[PDB]
Amino acid sequence: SLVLLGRVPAHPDSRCWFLAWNPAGTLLASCGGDRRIRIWGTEGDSWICKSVLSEGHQRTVRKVAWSPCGNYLASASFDATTCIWKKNQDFECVTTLEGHENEVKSVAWAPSGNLLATCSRDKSVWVWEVDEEDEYECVSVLNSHTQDVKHVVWHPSQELLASASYDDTVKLYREEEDDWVCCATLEGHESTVWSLAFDPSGQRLASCSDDRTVRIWRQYLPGNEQGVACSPSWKCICTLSGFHSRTIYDIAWCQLTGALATACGDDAIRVFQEDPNSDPQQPTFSLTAHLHQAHSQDVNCVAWNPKEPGLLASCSDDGEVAFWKYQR
């Protein structure tokens, strides 16, 4: 049960590509094909536009991400740059990250606040360090993906980075002896991996794909009771198959409640819950919501509020954002 709380025309006559809540869950950033980033907050009984972020980008803003402190927003653009915006009382464009050869598809901040990752059609993930002066420098280029990189996201607490690619793989990266290495390549999807989400425990990662499945990957540390061989290892422990009629464009795993939402090319939002009597080594999930025509076109993003459990935001190719209350 997913109840509609409100709709806003966030990016009129263009795609709304992505949404991101600030850590406080008080503001929602949206971005899309009109080159603008909009910040949404409640005023009275409605979500309204508090700020419009323009004149940072000359092309589509594909994704946005907030710093763990909530003071900064990053925007990944088809103009091959990522802009950093600082919140002041309004947002100002403070920095432009240049270096990618082609369209930037995603951006994400590490939980330390000291690093961010961007990824690109140029088939790479770049790791950037921010210093005390608010200056940004590329500290590592991660080039092992062989195709267009679609998404980056960091672990909820650790300096562990995940990426998803048109090459059908998910990769994990960490810092080892003063340099960033790919510590896992997760194979199993049969087509493009569009998005990723870590679970509340941080021990698992969900991926979604053009192959119309969600895969659940679990981290196994050396000496695990399950006997997963290590040289941590990641293994697929669940595939949610046969539940999506079209490409799955986005996945969101609620850090508060563990509810797993998906955004699909059939215009529907679905929510799944892990079965609390299932074996955690071979878990099962139940479909708990299936909202047909959630939007009038493809759903590109779902994002759970990090402070209000069950509050879900979604957006669509039709330019709209919707707010929902999930009744479990």
Side-chain angles (χ1 to χ4, degrees), residues 1-35 37-49 51-54 56-87 91-133 135-175 179-327:
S1 191
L2 206 46
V3 178
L4 178 64
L5 303 173
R7 301 187 178 273
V8 296
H11 298 268
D13 293 343
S14 71
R15 297 179 194 259
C16 186
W17 272 124
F18 206 74
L19 312 174
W21 290 104
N22 68 346
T26 56
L27 300 172
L28 180 77
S30 71
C31 62
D34 65 358
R35 312 183 286 109
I37 304 133
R38 290 186 175 88
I39 312 293
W40 306 88
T42 297
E43 281 198 357
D45 65 353
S46 309
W47 289 89
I48 71 128
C49 186
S51 319
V52 177
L53 286 50
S54 54
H57 293 296
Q58 296 294 81
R59 300 191 59 194
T60 288
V61 183
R62 185 55 186 81
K63 291 191 180 151
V64 289
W66 292 86
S67 58
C69 63
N71 302 121
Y72 300 91
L73 183 76
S75 50
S77 175
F78 284 7
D79 68 16
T81 72
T82 293
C83 288
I84 311 296
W85 308 77
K86 188 164 191 178
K87 198 163 81 85
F91 287 80
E92 64 158 322
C93 187
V94 291
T95 174
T96 302
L97 308 188
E98 299 160 33
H100 280 302
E101 299 182 323
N102 304 281
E103 289 84 348
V104 189
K105 302 304 188 57
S106 191
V107 61
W109 297 80
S112 64
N114 297 137
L115 300 164
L116 59 155
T118 65
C119 67
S120 172
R121 175 179 169 240
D122 77 5
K123 313 176 188 172
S124 75
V125 172
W126 284 36
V127 178
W128 303 84
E129 179 182 341
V130 58
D131 65 16
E132 71 280 358
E133 289 287 312
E135 300 171 353
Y136 297 72
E137 199 166 30
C138 176
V139 296
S140 187
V141 177
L142 300 165
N143 246 116
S144 61
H145 273 310
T146 62
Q147 304 287 342
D148 188 6
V149 189
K150 297 305 194 175
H151 197 56
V152 282
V153 69
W154 296 81
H155 190 272
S157 65
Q158 299 178 27
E159 307 288 277
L160 170 68
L161 175 63
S163 66
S165 170
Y166 187 85
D167 73 11
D168 304 348
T169 73
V170 174
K171 288 174 171 284
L172 285 298
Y173 318 89
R174 59 187 198 169
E175 189 168 22
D179 202 2
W180 289 78
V181 300
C182 174
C183 56
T185 300
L186 316 186
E187 302 174 5
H189 282 296
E190 291 184 7
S191 193
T192 305
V193 192
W194 283 108
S195 198
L196 307 163
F198 285 93
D199 77 325
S201 84
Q203 302 186 316
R204 300 172 305 163
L205 180 64
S207 54
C208 67
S209 175
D210 178 72
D211 72 13
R212 307 179 177 174
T213 72
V214 170
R215 285 181 170 260
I216 310 299
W217 312 86
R218 181 175 170 181
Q219 181 193 56
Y220 294 90
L221 312 172
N224 61 86
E225 78 166 312
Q226 296 83 14
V228 173
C230 292
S231 43
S233 294
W234 292 74
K235 290 268 169 197
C236 184
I237 63 170
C238 180
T239 305
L240 297 183
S241 51
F243 283 82
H244 295 81
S245 74
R246 299 287 189 275
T247 308
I248 315 171
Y249 285 115
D250 198 36
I251 190 156
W253 208 338
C254 180
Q255 286 284 306
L256 293 178
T257 69
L260 187 57
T262 63
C264 190
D266 59 13
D267 307 1
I269 294 166
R270 292 169 179 81
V271 183
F272 298 84
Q273 297 203 162
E274 190 161 351
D275 296 323
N277 298 319
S278 68
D279 184 346
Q281 289 298 130
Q282 191 186 324
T284 56
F285 289 73
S286 299
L287 181 71
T288 56
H290 182 171
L291 201 53
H292 294 77
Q293 295 310 132
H295 293 283
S296 73
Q297 289 183 48
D298 285 7
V299 191
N300 284 319
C301 180
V302 282
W304 294 107
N305 193 292
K307 294 293 175 189
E308 173 168 339
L311 178 53
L312 179 73
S314 65
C315 71
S316 179
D317 277 342
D318 70 13
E320 294 200 2
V321 171
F323 302 82
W324 315 87
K325 174 70 173 81
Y326 167 64
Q327 277 92 342

